[PDB]
Design a protein around this ligand. Sequence first.
Ligand SMILES: Nc1ncnc2c1ncn2[C@@H]1O[C@H](COP(=O)(O)OP(=O)(O)O)[C@@H](O)[C@H]1O
Length: 520
Amino acid sequence: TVVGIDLGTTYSCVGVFKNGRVEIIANDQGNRITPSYVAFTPEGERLIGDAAKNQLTSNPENTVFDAKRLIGRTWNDPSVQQDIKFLPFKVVEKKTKPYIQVDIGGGQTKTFAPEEISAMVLTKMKETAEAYLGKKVTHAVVTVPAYFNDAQRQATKDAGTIAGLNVMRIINEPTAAAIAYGLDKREGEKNILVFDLGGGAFDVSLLTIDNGVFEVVATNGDTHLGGEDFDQRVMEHFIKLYKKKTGKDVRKDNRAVQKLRREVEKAKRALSSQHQARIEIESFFEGEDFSETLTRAKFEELNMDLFRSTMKPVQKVLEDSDLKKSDIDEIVLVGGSTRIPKIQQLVKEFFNGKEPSRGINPDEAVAYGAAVQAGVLSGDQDTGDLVLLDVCPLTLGIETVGGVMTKLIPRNTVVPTKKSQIFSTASDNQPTVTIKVYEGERPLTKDNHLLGTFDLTGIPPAPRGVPQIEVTFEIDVNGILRVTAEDKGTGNKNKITITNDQNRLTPEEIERMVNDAEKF
Ligand SMILES: Nc1ncnc2c1ncn2[C@@H]1O[C@H](COP(=O)(O)OP(=O)(O)O)[C@@H](O)[C@H]1O
């Protein structure tokens, strides 16, 4: 049995399709969602989920969360460096990547890739399913944000592999939510706008849905905008307010900062139905108390630029799809941050008063869709006929003379897809040709994201411009790039091997990580 797993920034959820419906599976504490948290106690045990989250404020330095905000990123990514200020665990550079360093008891230290932390969360979700089903789970569909880049997708797949899962399919969050919405609808072709604002990432997708055929027409998002940022804006407001009023800087006392996080999260949720919320921390800093009242007005003001920025991807999607606001037949709100009244108001006002679709739990819609997809890919016959056409989120291009982004595969192209191009040499007997591939929509590569540098190696001695090497760029159904090369010269064909600077986790490295995880 293939399971569907929503691997979320703040929570994870696992479901299965059985006897013609989705079951969202409860964990050992009876909760249908599990916090995406891992902790290491001084006594040496590894805690996952609710038990890990519950000791955050007493053991903050060795409690890990928000790994999805770091996964597949490089060390000098501004979103990594900005998030470090709010995370209690040490983040250290290794392999040009942010690794997580913790104490595991007995004066001992261990360093983990974000992939490894997410693999521990996936392992717990797998075990939750295995307890319910009474048998081993080896295959899964796993969710990612629609706007995840190549590295973020591959790193999520690698987390699955470390957790002992054959990840059959990576599914984009809004597409999963669309399946939850539109499964078994036999209505005419409808244009559906999915507005997906979770704990860490924001996606907008426009889909056509017509009797089981789902097509993503356009997508745009922000992989570092979500509920965690709304908490962190309020946290920073109070850290600064405390220093102004007392002269004391609490930003290094991890217990203080994470007690503030706990209280802000509680207040934020309260402010979705109340207009005021009391923040109370007994023993905030140096044994002294902290009491403040947060109004809905103040919460909104502190975050208004972030809230208003969610309209930017909405307009980008309408422009790419060539649709007007009035062509949108349904608005599907998904992600727990869509519970914020101001977000609902901004979306409603953008679409001139149109109400969102009812009957959809924004916290569970993504997991529901992943479970359906898992059932379909298994070969189940009690699901509806599901046909999915999804897209690549980012234009792929190659750097050419003058730092120019020369487009190869445009954004919003249905995957899988491929493009080929012939390369040659600039100098006599040149043995290697380098190709830099970028992701993004700006005309200069310095303003886009480097996907990787690829070296065509083993080019046999020849005069300049004579070699003819056909390089193929294929984006698979998961949204991940593979680059291959073939010699198209006349006479003796030579093997052209490609090397890259992506620093993929190798099977050797994954095996080591599997063995390291079993020690807990
Ligand atoms: N009533 C609420 N008001 C405001 N924010 C909420 C509410 N309920 C949940 N959230 C936020 O939703 C985010 C989590 O969204 P969810 O979709 O459940 O999980 P994930 O994004 O981790 O997959 C968190 O940032 C949480 O604070």
